[PDB]
Design a protein around this ligand. Sequence first.
Ligand SMILES: [Zn+2]
Ligand SMILES: [Zn+2]
Ligand SMILES: [Zn+2]
Ligand SMILES: [Zn+2]
Ligand SMILES: [Zn+2]
Ligand SMILES: [Zn+2]
Lengths: 444, 444
Amino acid sequence: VLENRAAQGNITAPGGARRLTGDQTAALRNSLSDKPAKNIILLIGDGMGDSEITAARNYAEGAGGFFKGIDALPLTGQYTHYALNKKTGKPDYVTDSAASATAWSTGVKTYNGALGVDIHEKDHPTILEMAKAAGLATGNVSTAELQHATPAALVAHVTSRKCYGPSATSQKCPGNALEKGGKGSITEQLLNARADVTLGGGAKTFAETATAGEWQGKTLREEAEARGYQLVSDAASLNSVTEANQQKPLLGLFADGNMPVRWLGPKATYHGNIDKPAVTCTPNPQRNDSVPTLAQMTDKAIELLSKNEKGFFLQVEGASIDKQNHAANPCGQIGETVDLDEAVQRALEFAKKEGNTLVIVTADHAHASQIVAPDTKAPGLTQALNTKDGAVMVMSYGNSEEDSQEHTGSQLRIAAYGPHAANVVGLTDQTDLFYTMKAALGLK
Amino acid sequence: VLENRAAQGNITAPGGARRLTGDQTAALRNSLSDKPAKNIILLIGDGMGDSEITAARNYAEGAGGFFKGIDALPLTGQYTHYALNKKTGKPDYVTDSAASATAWSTGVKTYNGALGVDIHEKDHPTILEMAKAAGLATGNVSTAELQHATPAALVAHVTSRKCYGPSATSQKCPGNALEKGGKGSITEQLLNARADVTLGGGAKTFAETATAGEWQGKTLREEAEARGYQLVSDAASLNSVTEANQQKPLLGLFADGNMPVRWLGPKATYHGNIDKPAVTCTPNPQRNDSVPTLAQMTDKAIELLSKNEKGFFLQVEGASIDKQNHAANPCGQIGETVDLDEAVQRALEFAKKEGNTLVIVTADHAHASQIVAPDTKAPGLTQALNTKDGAVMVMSYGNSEEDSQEHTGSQLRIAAYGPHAANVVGLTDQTDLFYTMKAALGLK
Ligand SMILES: [Zn+2]
Ligand SMILES: [Zn+2]
Ligand SMILES: [Zn+2]
Ligand SMILES: [Zn+2]
Ligand SMILES: [Zn+2]
Ligand SMILES: [Zn+2]
């Protein structure tokens, strides 16, 4: 249906602000397919609700603008993502990164903090696992440290998202502690899952020594190398990769912790929309040209995984949308949503040429950021920005007196393109997503 | 495809949180129609963003619940609603009730405070006016005072939403003051528009005397009578009406200002989620049993209007969702969202039976309210509630240090059922809505 949702002309004139060219009915009808998908790409913007897409479009593309990727997905709906209270099993209206990530990769709700386990601490398999078993190639890319909840919730079953490596699993997930007869720390289970392509950051946890098993004394990196993993650390090496399979999986660790953000801008402040000058985001001088971009990572991955005839399952995550949104930093937060949009375009481009791919773009939960009037005297942290329209936009963060703005529970946008995309429409639940992908791929 | 979007069973168990029974593809495909709507019902929730639909579902139906009306609409998407700066013609990221209401009834963007006029102050015809011209019956119901921006924007073209009656038009819209050769105040233009069914509050402005014209010296109420209008002021009278047409138009004034809210509850407070006990909303003891409910007014309207063989156009508004959201009062807000759902149900029930009706449910813009974690130490106004899950939900309002919480610019939900509904899917603009309706009805 869509392709061009930018305003038609002069937004001050009748029908100049319109985004529709004509009637969607027929076109939408010719976008609805129930034939099985061969591949699947799920782009997740951590903490990217509707208020985040809007504020990024307004700034990067202007009010009547249109994201060539994020907004170009025809089928749309809103979905629920509430977590559960571990004890009572009552809903916890505001999920975290882990409970939410677990819900779409597992199909079962859980308490906040849990990775790959229901409230009974019982393990369920992720869609990446079911994928690998069926023969498909699997990929996991993100801009966050690979041990972070979102990329991790596909390759690890643990009791606390804080169990990154050996050192922390023995203390917080004693039962998963390798020594204590457990599957191991997040990193260790990641290394076990052995998805074909895995790119992101978090190289520091791989500096830890395994406490038990066949590779004790050896750091996790050494273990990885020992186990047949190709390890790349920058744009160049990643580009040099010619193949990624079970015999030669790819592992890219491009940062100690999280990969750097693209734009730099001052942190929002109290009465900053009034006491302070409007700001304009400038590129981040810290981020080197050696650190790949989410779109480059997303691109290489599709290239390596597309060689598998059975198909592939890929999950991409723009992580720092969340982190900057926590930090109350409009610029880092917007640069990150733009960055994801590029990744989404690379996906959409392939999905279109191929024809049997199903692309889904959504978020794990809503977040703090709100778009308010220029003259707003708000209690939280505000900041004025110079959008592309030449107008000023004021963003507000007013849900935490703490040094971190919190997520929120508002239902949010879920959009998709491809085979079985109709299952994204209307109201649904984060967990239906698991079942939508399992069935589109034809999994068991 | 819809009908039942409630969690299938046990949310703690795999697939129990799912809302989807099966594959939507075909059901959705058999919902896509481009045949002309014979009628149209537009339900508007003032300030009802996604974060508002959620907090009211969580509380009234529980996090795994589903609004029988608001959530039972198959085709969904998000739409923008930015206003325009009057001077520069640049986008104003956060609209108001008027700029927004003008955009969907007229199809052109405008500055904030404007009803039926573009930024040049030029008048444009509304969809109610274009409907009356074509022979269709017209109705405009709302729980706010009829002079309020949303119901007014369909029958009045003015330069400031503040020009309610003769007295303030001479002041703020002197070029609209009847005396100075203008079309008149909002109330006066409403009395001229003469839609078949008009129900709501704002009976106090009808106590004003006309300054010029045929009926000067008389109250606007008296004029309404003189002009052949049926005046009903309570449910008993409303129920008693048997017909409403151009010869016998209906005018229901159920309150001096706004109709009373349905539920009572304490106003959110600073640190209210921690210094205070969770609250439970109670019905409003003040609301007389004689004041109709939005669903009752929506019901009688559809009854009288559906008698026209050409068809009808009806706009229904759940007004106080916005006002309570401004007031930082979760209970009034939610009761009002619940109030509208019942109206939506009445709408869908008719639409489904008839078969040629298009029902659209949305909001004019986003608002302040946020759902936050229960232990949230927020800088604004918080308040903890006892939901239906027996769980506690914390709501925050942190965008204004003033005594009024502000709207927000986040794109929000637009959902529809019926002929031409596919045009609601994807990203669109508030103004596109105008063209979709105009097209659906076959208006010139
Ligand atoms: Zn998250
Ligand atoms: Zn994340
Ligand atoms: Zn977060
Ligand atoms: Zn409004
Ligand atoms: Zn209103
Ligand atoms: Zn308002």
